[PDB]
Every structure is written in structure tokens, then in C-alpha cells.
Design a binder for these strands. Structure first.
Length: 238
DNA sequence: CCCCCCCC
């Protein structure tokens, strides 16, 4: 029986949520001073709230191919505990981890559950944010560059890299780096309003941003401050 | 249990 995400608490292992996926990761392996394994993570949203959920190893195999982004599912039992704020933009005290107990059945998208949500920081306000801290931002993609292939000696990877320059009603332009696939797909033609959840702050250049693979980019967010942006921009931004 | 996200 279905409770909101707002209600979920480590003190009660009996719960079902009807949540829609807003972010699914790809499967990633790790190995360290502690452990070995693979995982993928999700970000969920309902009418009450949002939550990050992560499946490991044997659930990654169960569940990776049964969950896709933008769809609505019942999630039933997982592991809850304090969110590591360091590593998310997601707005919850806790954080779910699948287990052998987890069930994931498809739920009806008839209650229209919402889409990504954001807690924005003005591009003029990033001066007051810390390096490595995660931000949410909305901006006109004033301009963008072609993608290039960076070469990472530290770990031996050749990554796609695409810089984009984002401006908001303050006239402050911030450089933002896309990586990998993102760097490759992105087309900012007609200068769209982008809303990016969980972009990571960087100090290169004073303040810039790095769009991580955990970040969630919405091309023309159907949200009030996007019309507010295009409005200004087609006037003062010109 | 991850939590790396790269470069100038």
C-alpha cells in the first residue's frame, strides 16, 4: 500500500511508492579499499517529494532492464538511510538501496506525477557557492562550441567534451562543460533554455560548472522561470 | 556497497 516518498523512513521497512523515474544511470563497476561490484542509480519523484535509489550487482541485473526514464513504477521495500548530501542534488534526508526484498512493478501514469524539480542558484550567485558543491541552474544557452576529444592520462580515457555558455536574467554568463555522450548529442541551436539539476561547481575561471553524468538536463523546461528567461532574453538579452 | 566525471 502506497505511501508518498515524503513519508519513507528507515524505521519502517513496509512501504510501496508510486514514483516516476527522472534519472537512470548506466551500469558502472567499482573496486576499492573496501569493495568490488557494479551498480546503477535512479532518481524518483512523486507529488510529495523525490529520492535517489541505487541498485547493486544482482539487482542491477534484475532491474536495469525493467526501468526506464520518464515512466512510473511501484517501488516496494529497499534500504533507507541518510543521504550523502555531498554527492546529490536530490532533496531528501534519506536514500534508497535495493535488496533481495525490492519489488518494482509498473504504475499507472494517470495521477499525473511531476517531472524533474530544481532548487536553482542564480548564475550571479555561483560566486557565493563552493567548489565541488552541487547546484541547480536555469539559463539560455547563449552559445555552444563543437565537441572535442579530451585525453585523460590519470585513468586512460578519451572523453568527448563540449563547452556551453549559459546566461540568466542577470546577464552573467557561465561556462559549463558537458562530457561523453552529452558532449556529443548536445545541439544548442536557437539558444534554448536549459535547466540543469545537480551540476557541479568548479573554480576554473573564477566560477564555472561541470555537467556530470548524474546531472539531469532538460532542454526547454515547461516551468515558469523558463518563460521568464526567454521573455527577458528576447528583450534585454538581445 | 557508489559517490569517478576527466581538459584547459
Amino acid at each position: 500500500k502506497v505511501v508518498p516518498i515524503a513519508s519513507l523512513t528507515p524505521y519502517q521497512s513496509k512501504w510501496t511508492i508510486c514514483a516516476r523515474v527522472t534519472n537512470k544511470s548506466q551500469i558502472r563497476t567499482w573496486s576499492n579499499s573496501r569493495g568490488e561490484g557494479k551498480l546503477f542509480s535512479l532518481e524518483l519523484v512523486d507529488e510529495s517529494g523525490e529520492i535517489r535509489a541505487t541498485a547493486f550487482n544482482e539487482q542491477v541485473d534484475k532491474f536495469f532492464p525493467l526501468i526506464e526514464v520518464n515512466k512510473v513504477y511501484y517501488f516496494s521495500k529497499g534500504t533507507l538511510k541518510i543521504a550523502n548530501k555531498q554527492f546529490t542534488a536530490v532533496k531528501n534526508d534519506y536514500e534508497m538501496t535495493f535488496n533481495n526484498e525490492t519489488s518494482v512493478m509498473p504504475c499507472e501514469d494517470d495521477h499525473h506525477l511531476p517531472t524533474v524539480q530544481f532548487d536553482f542558484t542564480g548564475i550571479d550567485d555561483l560566486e557565493n557557492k563552493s567548489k565541488d558543491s552541487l547546484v541547480d541552474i536555469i539559463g539560455i544557452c547563449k552559445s555552444y562550441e563543437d565537441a572535442t576529444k579530451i585525453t585523460v592520462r590519470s585513468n586512460n580515457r578519451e572523453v568527448a567534451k563540449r563547452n556551453i555558455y549559459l546566461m540568466d536574467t542577470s546577464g552573467k554568463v557561465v561556462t559549463a562543460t558537458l562530457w561523453g555522450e552529452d558532449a556529443d548529442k548536445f545541439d544548442g541551436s536557437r539558444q534554448p533554455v536549459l535547466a540543469i539539476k545537480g551540476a557541479r561547481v568548479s573554480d576554473f575561471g573564477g566560477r564555472s560548472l561541470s555537467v556530470l553524468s548524474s546531472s539531469t538536463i532538460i532542454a526547454n523546461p515547461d516551468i515558469p522561470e523558463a518563460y521568464k528567461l526567454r521573455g527577458w532574453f528576447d528583450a534585454e538579452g538581445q
